[PDB]
Write a protein that binds this ligand. Structure first.
Ligand code: NI
Ligand code: NI
Ligand code: NI
Ligand code: NI
Lengths: 359, 356
């Protein structure tokens, strides 16, 4: 089962890529995943609270710890521009982030581990998670009790800039925290909230502050009472994430007071940083070594992944999967080399066996 | 006499009771027409002016023609005075004292009507619509009402000044008003450029009144845009400031690898009082026992300025012993100033026509 198994992985990837679904709307995707696992008699867990998304489980022949392997299943509201034979048949929707690839790979992993139950010193729970793109699915999975009793969680993201056969590996911070902020500048010379707003932009913009919206006034003649701005903060360390809002507040409050105005600062947490546990570092390396694949030191990503929400609760490891792509995530012409389907399915199957040996 | 003062008060109050917005001064137009026609004062036929009244009083000797102007439009503001003659139209009031300007100048006309032998030339009366939107003075000019007019005079009530006091000065009285628009875009951080441009410009006064950038808290913005006003007092400073603002805007924008497009929209020039009438303005107060003070400048704009770029003109402050500033819902006015203003402009016309 070499070429036959690979073609089976390719065909699943392409079926999903051809029929992409948006966050929380993955009805058919959920249906296909369920069917594909039941084909190989892999137990599917009953989680009625998850309308979309699939939870599966493979038990070893010994009692042991439970670990989890996660794939994301949702696509994006973007028109595909690849001109591939299996391109989205749904105009304006596309798997432009390779989640079709993640899904097919982890189904592969389940299929390989299904024939290797005697090697498993415990249980692997498979998580096919909806709504990664809106950072809402991981929270739904957690609240469904899917991670109760789970010791460790593992995941991947395709990395177009890395070659096939290469897995990106680092301990600690991999992907940035994402947080929303809003500042309203109003009075108490009538008032100058605009001048205040201008200095605060220059004052605010280890963390990266990105102001994305500024709105003050309606007409050229009338002096505005308010000025509002909003944006995101991105950090890599936990303390930086806890120290920047107060620093941003102090700056906004001080500048505004200089102009006879007052500042309202609002903070809305979105995502913690993807933080990799160093206890799995050795396992992540030896899994690639056993299969003759390569590892590189993972470069950090400015993006946020809701996989980080899992890692707030239990130890976890998230890796880059080299896919030799042409465009970055979310591009209309985004591609991936399907040879990585063998790499990724085998990698997580071997990682699961290795982790359960030592965990 | 009390009867004539009662008459001006009643016209003031009737217009106050029924205020009309810019270019909607239909009822106001007809009342002014009637009131002048009851005194056999000639109304000139100007078909193109739908609202507004042009009137004329000829002296008994041929000579120059001068104009005396009042504005007639009100504002979309709810009256909070609680006066018996408060606006009957909810959400509209004479919060800028244009009812007073109108009643006073009708007074001036009614006085000068009985002084035809003293007038060495002609006086034309302009009851101008749409002052508040700076559109009426241009319409008056386009209708040829100032063809052959040598000088123009006007007033505005000044609540801070006492009754019997006229605010007089040569040169710039009120600021010019100009509109500008800046767009910051890629040839790259538009917001940082925008924040820096705001700081880089917010005798001229620049007021950014409008800022827009981005749509959603996730999406990186492609462009930022600003709108605002520029106010100047000198003619050279009005021309130099947009070139200066363009340099700062494009400079900073290039710093952040962006582009700044600067658009300019002229609204009003400054009110510039011709010095040749300074003496006449002082003499008219003196002969009547009224006081003059050196007029303090105003940040606001008046479309009377448009007349002044065509012909020599003089705009004065009329003391009205008020409490609240122009445009305030509780804006008031001391009616005894109707005697002062109507008499002042009668005498000024007689003095101007013999000295110009
Ligand atoms: Ni994505
Ligand atoms: Ni993704
Ligand atoms: Ni006004
Ligand atoms: Ni006014």
């Amino acid at each position: 089962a070499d070429k036959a198994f690979h073609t089976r992985l390719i065909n699943m990837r392409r079926d999903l890529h051809e029929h992409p679904e948006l966050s929380f709307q993955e009805v058919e995707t959920t249906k296909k995943i369920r069917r594909w696992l039941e084909e190989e008699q892999i137990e599917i867990l009953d989680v009625p609270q998850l309308k979309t998304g699939v939870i599966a489980e493979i038990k070893g022949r010994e009692d042991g710890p439970v670990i989890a392997i996660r794939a994301d299943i949702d696509a994006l509201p973007i028109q595909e521009q690849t001109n591939l034979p299996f391109a989205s048949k749904v105009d304006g929707t596309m798997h432009a982030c390779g989640h079709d690839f993640h899904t097919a790979s982890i189904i592969g992993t389940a299929m390989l581990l299904n024939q290797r139950r005697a090697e498993l010193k415990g249980t692997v729970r498979f998580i096919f998670q909806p709504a990664e793109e809106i950072a809402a699915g991981a929270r739904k999975v957690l609240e469904a009790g899917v991670l109760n009793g789970v010791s460790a969680i593992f995941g991947m993201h395709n990395k177009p800039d890395l070659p096939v056969g290469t897995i990106g590996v680092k301990e600690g911070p991999l992907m940035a925290s994402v947080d929303r902020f809003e500042i309203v500048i109003k009075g108490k010379n009538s008032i100058d909230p605009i001048a205040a707003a201008g200095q605060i932009i220059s004052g605010l913009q280890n963390a990266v502050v990105s102001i994305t919206r500024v709105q003050a006034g309606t007409s050229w003649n009338v002096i505005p009472d308010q000025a509002e701005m909003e944006g995101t903060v991105r950090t890599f360390q936990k303390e930086a994430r806890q120290a920047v809002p107060e620093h941003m507040r102090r700056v906004a409050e001080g500048i505004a007071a200089g102009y006879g105005a007052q500042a309202e600062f609002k903070w809305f947490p979105y995502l913690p940083s993807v933080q990799n546990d160093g206890t799995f570092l050795n396992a992540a390396s030896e899994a690639a070594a056993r299969l003759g694949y390569q590892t590189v030191h993972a470069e950090q990503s400015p993006g946020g992944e809701d996989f980080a929400l899992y890692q707030e609760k239990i130890p976890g490891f998230f890796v880059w999967m080299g896919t030799n792509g042409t465009e970055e995530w979310h591009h209309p012409a985004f591609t991936l080399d399907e040879e990585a389907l063998t790499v990724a399915s085998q990698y997580f199957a071997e990682l699961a066996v290795i982790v359960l040996e030592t965990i």
